[PDB]
């Protein structure tokens, strides 16, 4: 219905009404480009949905010839900083793994170790944010490496919505990345672990979703983004929340998230 569609904004804002902190939302129709969004030009910590840009700027490396797939990277524990102990068994001992591999862990389990190393490889925070720039996503700003933000919660990663799902309608499309990259990393995303409750919580079963989470611990930042698709030939819906300093506990804003994407998908299918 075009009525359900142009009363999304409504929907939303009743959601979220009375959550408290900064609530950033943009809802893309990809085929369309129908946009609803709610704070949608503000920049909102990323934590892990950094690791999106990240992916696009080693790819692109890749296709500018700077970098191949399967280069050989070799890890070590001193690679490890020492707050991360979510993945540190596969950082036990000197291990190669290649280009691919390292982003493969970076998007499915939002791993730290591997996208520091990845960092490395494209020229750092700078040059993640000059890619982001000169594909047409001026509103990303990658300061930080992951270790330099762990010891000081000041100057984090910011993005916003609009941008984030500005960038998730292209590499949907086909325009963003090569086929065959653009598969690799949405099959990636595809798989991502750590956001059953967001994004896929509230969706009808059968609803395929791509997509990446961030988290701040003690629910000081709750993200989302990713792709929705749609039944039939209704098409796909890029999305992007993100949560910070809201009132709510950890789950109210999970659940936050996953009915924003069902209210989104129910106003863009019939």
């Known amino acids: 219905k075009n009525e359900a569609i142009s009363m999304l904004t409504e929907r939303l804002s009743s959601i979220i009404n009375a959550a408290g902190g900064d609530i950033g939302i943009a809802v893309i129709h990809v085929e369309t480009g129908h946009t609803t969004a709610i704070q949608g030009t503000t920049q909102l910590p990323l934590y892990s ?3 999106l840009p990240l992916a696009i700027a080693v790819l692109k490396e890749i296709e500018e010839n700077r970098l191949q797939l399967d280069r050989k990277v070799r890890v070590t524990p001193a690679d490890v900083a020492p707050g991360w102990t979510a993945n ?3 950082w036990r001992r000197p291990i190669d793994r290649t280009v691919a591999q390292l982003i493969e862990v970076s998007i499915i389990r939002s791993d730290n170790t591997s996208s ?3 960092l490395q490889l494209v020229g750092g925070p700078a040059a993640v944010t000059h890619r982001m720039r000169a594909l047409g996503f001026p509103n990303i700003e990658i300061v930080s ?3 330099e933000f762990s010891e000081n919660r000041t100057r984090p990663n910011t993005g916003s919505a609009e941008d984030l799902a500005r960038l998730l309608v ?3 499309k ?3 990345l090569q086929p065959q990259h653009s598969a690799l990393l949405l099959g990636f995303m595809h798989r991502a672990t750590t956001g059953t409750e967001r994004l896929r919580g509230s969706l009808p079963v059968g609803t395929p979703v791509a997509d990446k989470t961030g988290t701040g611990d003690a629910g000081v930042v709750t993200n ?6 749609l039944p039939k030939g209704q098409g796909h819906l890029a999305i992007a929340v993100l949560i910070s300093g809201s009132k709510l506990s950890p789950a109210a804003q999970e659940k936050l998230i996953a009915e924003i994407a069902r209210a989104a998908y129910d106003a863009h299918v019939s």
């Open 49 to 51: 949905v950094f690791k």
């Open 88 to 90: 540190a068994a596969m």
């Open 116 to 118: 520091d190393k990845l």
């Open 145 to 147: 490496t992951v270790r």
């Open 170 to 172: 292209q590499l949907q």
């Open 174 to 176: 086909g325009e963003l």
């Open 224 to 229: 989302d983004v990713g792709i929705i698709t």
